[PDB]
């Protein structure tokens, strides 16, 4: 099974001012002359990690990675002002011009696949190929499954904790209920809800439980992760339609793509990958048996490495 390339430092980085109150962190890694690529992290509000650099051949790829508005090293931290899908799409173009790339490969998993599609459908001309994982299209059915009733039936003992702070009436709409707490004037109230919401996801993203899931509880990370995720979901990803992303696939069918999705991905159901593949015949679909949601699930990682090497030779 293929694994990550060895660790390496970014050869350059900085902060880009959006002009509307955001200074977003970015970093360039790999080969300054290599094939251009951009990494879209998940969440939203997930942030990048040094390991994401190791997802591409160090000598064949010029990888630009960045923290989306409000998370990671991007300032202001946990900010919900001017934080929408369309601003992020704008930011990607901005970052593209700066790095001086004419066209690049878009790599994105989970929310990253969502923003990748929105971006690709908005600027088809700028995408050479796409490597998508754990498809998430933001349909209400997708949000209901993960935050109202669905995954809850596979992890009832964990879902009981998420509901613990809610009154019986609030339980009918968990997203809305958490939205109030996450936007409370009391930071202690915000953090309590933020931790619960983040750990729920941290513990259901892998096939088997891992200690790693506890890092989703760190105050600063949890706070921005929850606020931003909940923000985007509260507004249905800022899409015109429930199925806008599937409805506009015609605009990118001509683009080479690979779709990797764990059979037992509990955050995003395989159904999403199947629906996408049905509308996108050209795309190469890979349903990884025995795998969960996370990019580092042995079987999912294997297909991603093979996918990136393939597009680079
Ligand atoms: C509903 N939130 C799922 C999501 O977009 C997400 N959370 N973590 C990830 C990565 C696997 C990309 C780290 O994606």
XYZ file of C-alpha atoms and ligand atoms in Angstrom:
327
model
C 0.000 0.000 0.000
C 1.246 3.436 -1.068
C 1.876 5.961 1.696
C 2.788 9.623 2.084
C 6.040 11.005 0.717
C 8.609 11.971 3.364
C 8.201 15.210 5.430
C 9.411 18.492 3.977
C 9.212 22.197 4.760
C 7.407 24.663 2.510
C 9.852 26.590 0.338
C 7.831 29.787 0.751
C 4.796 31.193 2.552
C 3.018 34.338 3.639
C -0.260 36.120 4.221
C -2.475 37.579 1.511
C -4.772 40.493 2.275
C -8.249 40.058 0.785
C -9.094 43.731 1.147
C -12.263 43.052 3.137
C -10.745 42.205 6.506
C -8.974 38.923 5.855
C -5.295 38.010 5.753
C -5.083 34.408 4.581
C -2.101 32.148 5.152
C -0.645 30.225 2.208
C 2.477 28.213 1.543
C 4.244 26.811 -1.507
C 5.723 23.325 -1.416
C 7.398 20.866 -3.766
C 9.080 22.055 -6.964
C 8.876 25.771 -7.900
C 9.010 24.583 -11.505
C 6.832 21.497 -11.040
C 3.228 20.887 -12.076
C 0.914 23.406 -10.334
C -1.634 22.177 -7.806
C -3.829 23.607 -5.062
C -4.936 21.789 -1.901
C -8.395 22.533 -0.486
C -8.719 21.485 3.172
C -11.998 20.274 4.659
C -14.378 21.334 7.404
C -15.069 24.096 6.540
C -12.648 25.629 9.036
C -10.438 22.545 9.196
C -7.118 24.116 8.254
C -4.009 22.628 6.647
C -1.344 20.506 8.320
C 2.258 19.839 7.277
C 1.266 16.294 6.253
C -0.873 17.642 3.402
C 2.394 18.631 1.699
C 3.448 14.973 1.589
C 0.416 14.116 -0.602
C 2.339 15.091 -3.742
C 5.573 14.042 -5.425
C 8.125 16.572 -4.063
C 9.939 16.715 -7.387
C 6.995 16.847 -9.782
C 4.481 19.123 -8.058
C 4.363 22.798 -7.154
C 1.721 22.700 -4.400
C -0.029 25.771 -3.014
C -1.783 25.151 0.311
C -3.735 27.699 2.334
C -5.981 28.082 5.355
C -9.477 29.220 4.421
C -10.891 32.395 5.988
C -11.137 32.331 9.763
C -9.172 29.151 10.483
C -5.634 27.891 10.983
C -3.118 30.687 10.538
C -5.573 32.962 8.691
C -6.666 36.111 10.526
C -9.071 37.094 12.065
C -9.416 33.719 13.795
C -12.932 32.221 14.000
C -14.371 35.153 12.070
C -17.744 34.714 10.415
C -17.635 38.124 8.713
C -17.435 37.922 4.909
C -16.981 34.182 5.243
C -18.945 32.460 2.458
C -18.410 29.895 -0.289
C -18.167 32.591 -2.951
C -15.527 34.642 -1.106
C -13.416 31.495 -0.766
C -13.828 30.854 -4.485
C -12.569 34.414 -4.991
C -9.643 33.815 -2.649
C -8.558 30.800 -4.708
C -8.385 32.940 -7.847
C -6.444 35.572 -5.902
C -3.965 32.962 -4.697
C -3.733 31.618 -8.245
C -2.727 34.982 -9.763
C -0.153 35.529 -7.022
C 1.518 32.127 -7.457
C 1.503 33.019 -11.136
C -0.202 29.801 -12.223
C -2.310 29.705 -15.375
C -3.998 26.381 -14.667
C -3.667 23.837 -11.858
C -4.787 20.488 -10.486
C -7.407 20.811 -7.753
C -7.023 18.374 -4.843
C -9.822 18.362 -2.297
C -11.571 16.087 0.133
C -14.835 16.413 2.053
C -15.734 20.100 2.326
C -12.650 20.441 0.152
C -14.478 18.495 -2.565
C -17.436 20.830 -2.128
C -15.377 23.991 -2.597
C -13.417 22.249 -5.368
C -16.597 21.652 -7.346
C -17.914 25.167 -6.687
C -14.555 26.572 -7.787
C -14.201 24.298 -10.820
C -17.745 25.083 -11.960
C -17.037 28.803 -11.562
C -13.648 28.764 -13.303
C -13.506 25.605 -15.466
C -10.717 27.203 -17.480
C -8.315 27.122 -14.508
C -8.523 23.410 -13.642
C -6.393 20.808 -15.412
C -7.620 17.793 -13.402
C -9.295 16.982 -10.089
C -8.708 14.489 -7.310
C -11.840 14.359 -5.158
C -12.379 12.398 -1.951
C -15.330 11.879 0.388
C -17.857 13.712 -1.739
C -19.969 16.308 0.040
C -22.398 18.362 -2.085
C -24.250 20.168 0.716
C -27.734 18.822 -0.082
C -30.064 19.065 2.910
C -30.248 15.267 2.917
C -26.481 15.290 3.499
C -26.711 17.696 6.457
C -29.691 15.835 7.930
C -27.806 12.544 7.845
C -24.860 13.855 9.818
C -26.453 16.363 12.176
C -30.064 15.362 12.732
C -30.714 11.675 12.229
C -28.585 9.145 10.392
C -25.010 8.692 11.605
C -26.541 9.074 15.061
C -27.874 5.519 14.718
C -24.380 4.114 14.243
C -22.907 6.057 17.168
C -25.888 6.432 19.561
C -23.630 6.627 22.606
C -21.719 9.547 21.048
C -24.783 11.325 19.702
C -26.190 11.270 23.225
C -23.360 13.607 24.237
C -24.024 16.072 21.426
C -27.677 16.272 22.522
C -26.911 16.504 26.254
C -26.852 20.307 26.374
C -30.047 20.726 24.372
C -33.589 20.996 25.688
C -36.216 18.703 24.186
C -37.386 21.425 21.813
C -33.885 22.228 20.568
C -33.279 18.574 19.720
C -35.611 18.837 16.742
C -33.069 21.028 14.940
C -29.555 20.445 16.237
C -27.874 22.719 13.690
C -30.127 25.671 14.579
C -29.742 24.981 18.299
C -25.953 24.923 18.068
C -26.038 28.082 15.929
C -27.424 30.052 18.908
C -24.831 28.739 21.343
C -21.955 29.212 18.920
C -23.010 32.846 18.390
C -23.650 33.608 22.070
C -22.101 36.720 23.633
C -20.772 34.384 26.342
C -17.495 32.790 25.148
C -17.805 30.014 27.749
C -21.119 29.039 26.169
C -19.548 29.172 22.713
C -16.644 26.919 23.697
C -18.810 24.343 25.480
C -20.899 23.827 22.348
C -17.846 24.067 20.070
C -16.062 21.182 21.803
C -19.077 18.851 21.685
C -19.772 19.608 18.034
C -16.095 19.083 17.035
C -15.497 15.855 18.968
C -18.628 14.335 17.381
C -16.962 14.720 14.010
C -13.509 13.804 15.259
C -14.691 10.419 16.512
C -16.764 9.396 13.472
C -14.358 10.189 10.666
C -12.306 6.951 10.910
C -13.369 3.300 10.608
C -11.732 2.418 13.921
C -11.427 4.746 16.912
C -8.125 6.609 17.234
C -6.580 8.714 20.008
C -6.063 11.417 17.377
C -9.762 12.306 17.760
C -8.996 14.156 21.018
C -7.174 16.957 19.165
C -10.605 18.038 17.863
C -11.208 19.155 21.432
C -8.472 21.794 21.620
C -10.078 25.136 22.476
C -8.767 27.313 19.633
C -9.270 24.704 16.892
C -12.708 23.585 18.091
C -13.954 27.152 18.407
C -13.178 28.073 14.795
C -14.074 24.646 13.413
C -17.553 24.615 14.960
C -18.417 28.270 14.285
C -17.370 28.059 10.658
C -18.871 24.630 9.933
C -22.129 25.534 11.633
C -22.130 28.884 9.850
C -21.847 27.338 6.385
C -24.446 24.677 7.147
C -26.870 27.169 8.643
C -26.763 28.914 5.255
C -26.922 25.768 3.117
C -23.423 26.411 1.795
C -24.689 29.613 0.156
C -25.986 27.665 -2.851
C -28.910 28.757 -5.056
C -30.320 25.229 -5.102
C -30.152 22.132 -2.924
C -28.440 20.295 -5.786
C -26.644 23.191 -7.493
C -23.314 21.343 -7.448
C -24.684 18.205 -9.134
C -26.893 20.273 -11.435
C -23.862 22.135 -12.853
C -21.576 19.145 -13.412
C -22.088 19.562 -17.203
C -19.693 22.505 -16.976
C -16.781 20.302 -15.900
C -17.353 16.843 -17.379
C -14.522 17.524 -19.835
C -12.101 17.754 -16.901
C -10.075 14.636 -15.901
C -11.062 13.472 -12.414
C -10.722 10.714 -9.858
C -13.177 10.126 -7.004
C -12.140 8.199 -3.895
C -14.743 7.430 -1.230
C -14.804 5.089 1.757
C -17.599 2.511 1.795
C -18.194 3.200 5.490
C -17.633 6.951 5.384
C -19.998 8.083 8.146
C -19.639 11.841 7.545
C -20.448 11.743 3.821
C -22.409 8.791 2.469
C -21.137 6.880 -0.558
C -24.460 7.819 -2.158
C -22.936 11.252 -2.830
C -19.991 9.765 -4.714
C -22.382 7.518 -6.649
C -24.701 10.391 -7.549
C -21.728 12.419 -8.738
C -20.331 9.527 -10.811
C -23.753 8.996 -12.421
C -23.757 12.609 -13.616
C -20.064 12.424 -14.479
C -19.408 9.236 -16.558
C -15.882 10.339 -17.520
C -14.772 10.408 -13.878
C -12.922 7.446 -12.399
C -14.744 6.220 -9.274
C -13.146 4.268 -6.432
C -15.270 2.964 -3.606
C -12.705 1.837 -1.061
C -13.971 -1.200 0.873
C -13.270 -1.269 4.621
C -12.586 2.473 4.853
C -14.096 5.417 6.698
C -14.063 9.125 5.850
C -10.526 10.319 6.677
C -7.947 10.858 3.930
C -5.384 8.804 5.850
C -7.477 5.625 5.964
C -4.889 3.159 4.548
C -7.066 2.205 1.579
C -8.102 5.781 0.791
C -4.552 7.136 1.100
C -3.366 4.427 -1.282
C -5.788 5.557 -4.021
C -4.969 9.246 -3.527
C -1.214 8.751 -3.897
C -1.745 6.644 -6.999
C -4.033 9.375 -8.264
C -1.575 12.254 -7.836
C 1.408 10.282 -9.201
C -0.691 9.357 -12.215
C -1.508 12.954 -13.144
C 2.157 13.921 -12.802
C 3.524 10.957 -14.787
C -19.154 17.763 7.667
N -17.697 18.073 7.874
C -16.905 17.078 7.056
C -15.673 17.722 6.408
O -15.777 18.537 5.505
C -14.366 17.291 6.912
N -13.897 17.162 8.176
N -12.654 16.737 8.136
C -12.267 16.574 6.849
C -10.975 16.116 6.224
C -11.078 14.612 6.011
C -10.747 16.839 4.890
C -9.804 16.417 7.168
O -13.344 16.922 6.010
